[PDB]
Amino acid sequence: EAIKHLKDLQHIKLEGLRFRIIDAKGQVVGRLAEQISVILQGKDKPTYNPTKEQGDVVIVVNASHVELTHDKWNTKLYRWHTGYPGGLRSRPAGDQWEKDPRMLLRNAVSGMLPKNKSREARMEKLKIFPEADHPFQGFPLVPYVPPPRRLQ
Amino acid sequence: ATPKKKLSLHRRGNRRVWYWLKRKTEVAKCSYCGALSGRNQMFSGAAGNSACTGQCVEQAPTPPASSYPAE
Amino acid sequence: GYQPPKPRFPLPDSIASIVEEKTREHRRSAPAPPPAPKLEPRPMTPTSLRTGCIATKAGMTQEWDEHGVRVPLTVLWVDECQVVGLKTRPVHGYNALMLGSGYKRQKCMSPSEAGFFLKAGVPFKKLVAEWQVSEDALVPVGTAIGAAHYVAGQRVDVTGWTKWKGFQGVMRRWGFKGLPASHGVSLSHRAPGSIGNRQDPGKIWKGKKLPGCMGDERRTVHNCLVYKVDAARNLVYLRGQVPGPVGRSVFLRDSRLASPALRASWGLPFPTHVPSAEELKAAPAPGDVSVVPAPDGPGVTAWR
Amino acid sequence: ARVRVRLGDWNRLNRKWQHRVSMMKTMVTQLLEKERIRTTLAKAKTLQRYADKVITLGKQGTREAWSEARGIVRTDRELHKLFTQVALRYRERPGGFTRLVRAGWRERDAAPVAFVELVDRPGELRPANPALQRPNPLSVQAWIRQQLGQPAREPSPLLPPSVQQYLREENRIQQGR
Amino acid sequence: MIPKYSFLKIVDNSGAKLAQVIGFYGHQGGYASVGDVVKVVVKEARGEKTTAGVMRKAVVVEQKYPFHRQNGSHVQYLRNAAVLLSEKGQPIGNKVRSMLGVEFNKPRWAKLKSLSKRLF
Amino acid sequence: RLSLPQRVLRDLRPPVQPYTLAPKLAQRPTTTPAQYTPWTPTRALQRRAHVSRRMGFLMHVLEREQMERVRAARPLPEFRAGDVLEVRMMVPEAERKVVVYRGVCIAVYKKGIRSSFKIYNVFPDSGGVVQHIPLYMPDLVGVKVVGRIPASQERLYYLLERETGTSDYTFQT
RNA sequence: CCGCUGGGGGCGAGUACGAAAGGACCAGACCCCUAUAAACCUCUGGUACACUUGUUGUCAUUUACACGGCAUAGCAAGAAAGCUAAGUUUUAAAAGGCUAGAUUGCCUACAUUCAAUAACACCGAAUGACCCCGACUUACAAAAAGUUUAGGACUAAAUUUAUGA
RNA sequence: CACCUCGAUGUCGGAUCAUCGCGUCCUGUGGCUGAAGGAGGUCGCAAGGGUUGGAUUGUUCGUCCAUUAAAGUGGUACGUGAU
Ligand SMILES: [Mg+2]
Ligand SMILES: [Mg+2]
Ligand SMILES: [Mg+2]
Ligand SMILES: [Mg+2]
Ligand SMILES: [Mg+2]
Ligand SMILES: [Mg+2]
Ligand SMILES: [Mg+2]
Ligand SMILES: [Mg+2]
Ligand SMILES: [Zn+2]
């Protein structure tokens, strides 16, 4: 992590926004992805404009405390094509965790954003970290705790 | 083997990029007569240069030689 | 051939003070680079990878073994191959040895590349390459990797760039068969034939074999034997063919295809051939020929 | 389709080989009749190689060389010039009897044009270099040429003083038979 | 190189002056070469017991293509000939005729080293 | 601050033979001797030249080194391509047993360690069996010449369809 | 992201089995072949049209000596480079290739000439230059190497018109 | 059936070159075996790459010559004439 703490501090995006930190301990990937999508679009702001791309810098820690309920570790797949004949590639969720474990929440947030050309800028602002610390230690960052889970 | 529609002015301009010529980055200029050519080419009076005054070659002395002229 | 690189929005809303202090305290707290390796002969760990070599193809010749069989032998030449750069796990992400070969004059090289050799203190090489190596295989900068790095009977994986042939059709590039010379075939004796399959595919596949400029392609010949090593003259005598024309440099490495981790009992010196008595060796001068080893093999004419 | 340039061989010059050899024979005859001719680069390079071959054949001075040049060289006014003036002029030159200077492009087809001329003549465009360069016997080259088997190869007049003591003799004339 | 549907002169006194190769036993899908056994069909008889039109087994003893050896030498024969064989890997002929019977052979063909006039 | 000559500059050592201009060890022909070895210099100390104008010379010297080594190991008679030859050849397929061959040689096929010849013998019983032999193979013991037949042509491939009766040199059975 | 690792027969075994004829699973490894794929010209061959030899007709030839033109390169035979296969090597777990690339390092970098299709040559050269071309030698290269700055890549002086190129 | 093209649009063949599915002919394999291992019959997984000759018919139909481990069946406007 000698240079990984350096590269994540290199910012391409606009920075008039607010930084958010979310602990993903015990959170279901779908509901956390819904809340992260709402924060990323900037619709938690009274000054929201559909044309203007505001939002928040969402930082997620503990990406491997994230669970997939009802045997979706072996049955949920991730499929794409290569453009070549026979190019269907389907990866299971356990193999997706064993390849890159932050991609579960990454793809879940990607499927919930609006499908336009502002999606690249919104997916920049989602920074998902597997372990419990992030490079933005000294930053002024405001925590987003979700509403309590016990509706059931 | 036949165009199905008419080419637009923008598409025609994009297709015609191969037809354009590259500018040359060097030129050999004679200070007297103002002639212009490549640095590897003679452009004096022996070649085509009606403006040549001979000042392009500044020294040529070779008087002595001896041989059998075949007649 | 690159994507549109960087929007690069400059304004940080004054969070730049935190990022600049974080970067200053990040470079200053990173560990000091490990010391110069200084290698002498080392043990043979079974899961340990050795370096490679940049050798020059010099053509093919004829030799006969003691059993009396002709062997097609190409000859390679090691052109003062040295270690130029080094990469290791603490300071770089990987552990590699950077090799250089040949020589070029100062006026014949770009100033950006000549500066790298002048800082390293090595002569100006004409080719620079690198190989992945283990932690115990890091040989210091300036160390020669000659023919003595390899042994007779060893199997190597030679990597070469093929001969340029120009643009050719599908008859000799993909080896396709054409149409008959004289049965009514009209202007199609070397046609590729059907390429798509009608409306249902509706397109040509992304990997379709069509005529193109083949040539200069990095093809590797796997698991080829080493028949003779001349340490004094830097010559290795592989058996079989090597891709590329004569005079182009090729790459060599121990064959990872035949890898039981035993290295098949080949007598390989692990870090390199660490030379004892490097003194009393002549420079390019009136030297002579030296002695070489060779493998034998059993029963080439066991029966008829 | 056979590779001629890139694999050192004769140019094809867009012609069949019998036409090609006849055109080169005509051009070498023209090159020695008028000592500077102007042509396209490909014919100019081919003419330079052919001129070296023909001039050395004239330098041999033998009867077989005359017989071979009699078919190669057309004029006969210039067969005499090749065997006498050109042979005496380049008697000690180790090749390179011709220079090439590029002269731009021609109007009819925009083909590159080169001037091809014989060196070491009154009316040439660059000073020649001497074919030989008398050696200092007090330098490294002379000692390398003494330890190794090299001749002296000094510059010489047409008849050196080493034949003067034979030709001075009145008993070595035979009266002209 | 003996391709399929070729012709060759059987040399022994088994009763076949000529035969046509109609198949190859091994996975050799290209050509046959000296020392190989192939299925041949007798087109023309010598008038004796082996009449024309039979399908027997033959081993090729010599060919007009060069036969390369490991040392680097090769043997070139001016004829393409073969010798008939039985279902026991033995020639039905009493002796391989010396008219075209010189070959290089020591692998289990010791029975063919007595039928031939001379080896090598 | 600290000027010093490096270990790379310790290649400024005295030569082994103190007065040499041509390298020696060259297996090239008699005159115009080469003034550099094609293997040792590596451009560290050399009158520079292109590679593949240096590894072609390297191929020539390596071929010649083996060729005079075999020539020292056994001598051979000087012979043309139109003469009857007898070859003492040991067969590696057999237990290295020497078998004598006799035939007219129809070619001195090549030059180098890959020099070869082709001896043609019409066996009066089995017709003509021509054999190709590498001249510098270790399986040759010696050859001698007995029969001379002068021909203008250097390759006698026209004897493949001439009178087969007058090509009888060996009928071992 | 592409390619993607094919088999058969022996040896294992006259075998464990099995009254007995009748003969294996293991491919685990070694020996042969054969594909497919990737190369290479070392061997063997093919071709080789400014190479060598022989020869016919005819036109030139104050010698119907030599040489030259045309007749498919007139014909026929034999060739070296280059290309090529029918030739020669290699085809394991993952190997191997292609495109983008965090990084790291470096920077005396405007890009002209050496032949109009560099594919020779950028893993080459431009005069402190053998890069190209020519000349000389080599039958133990039926010719691709070695010497050589003769010619072209221009260029400089108060210690060499200049490298031991 | 006549919904689509008659301001006319290659199918009923193979020659070359392909891609995909598995209801697997082989190679890789597991169960039941009336299972002496062989040699078979099914049944379960598996589509990586292999499926050659030509004599006869305009035949994509079919044999039968004899070789292989086998001489697979289909979607491909019963693939493929701006080749
Ligand atoms: Mg027509
Ligand atoms: Mg053409
Ligand atoms: Mg003609
Ligand atoms: Mg060759
Ligand atoms: Mg030739
Ligand atoms: Mg005429
Ligand atoms: Mg071609
Ligand atoms: Mg010059
Ligand atoms: Zn002027």
Give a description of the structure.
Chain D: This is Mitochondrial ribosomal protein L17. Chain D: InterPro entries: Ribosomal_bL17, Ribosomal_bL17_CS, Ribosomal_bL17_sf. This is part of a larger assembly, with chains A (152 residues), B (71 residues), C (304 residues), D (177 residues), E (120 residues) and F (173 residues). Chain C contains two helices and eleven strands. With 304 residues, chain C is mainly beta. In chain C, a hairpin with a 5-residue loop joins strand 1 and strand 2. In chain D, a hairpin with a 6-residue loop joins strand 2 and strand 3. In chain D, helix 2 packs antiparallel against helix 3. Chain D is globular, with a radius of gyration of 20 Å. By secondary structure, chain E is mainly beta. Chains in contact: A-C, B-D, C-E, C-F, D-F, E-F. Bound molecules: magnesium ion (MG) (8 copies) and zinc ion. The site of zinc ion (ZN) has 6 residues of chain B, from loops. Chain C binds two RNA strands through strand 1, strand 2, helix 2, strand 6 and strand 9.
Greatest contact between two chains: C-F, 39 and 42 residues
Helix content of chain A: 25-40%
Query: What is the end-to-end distance of chain A?
Result: 40 Å
Name the bound molecules. magnesium ion, zinc ion
Number of distinct helices of chain A: 5
How do the SSEs of chain E run, as a string of H and E? EEEEEEEEHE
Q: Mind summarizing the main beta sheet of chain E? A: 5 strands, mixed
Structural class of chain A: alpha/beta
Overall, the morphology of chain A is: globular
Oligomer: part of a larger assembly
Percentage of residues in strands of chain A: 15-25%
Evaluate the radius of gyration of chain A: 16 Å
- The beta-strand count of chain A equals 6
Number of strands of chain E: 9
Strand order within the widest beta sheet of chain A: 5-2-1-6
The largest sheet of chain E has its strands arranged as 1-7-4-3-2
Largest sheet of chain A: 4 strands, parallel
Distinct helical segment count of chain E = 1
What's the order of the H and E elements of chain A?
HEHEEEHHHEE
Shape of chain E: globular
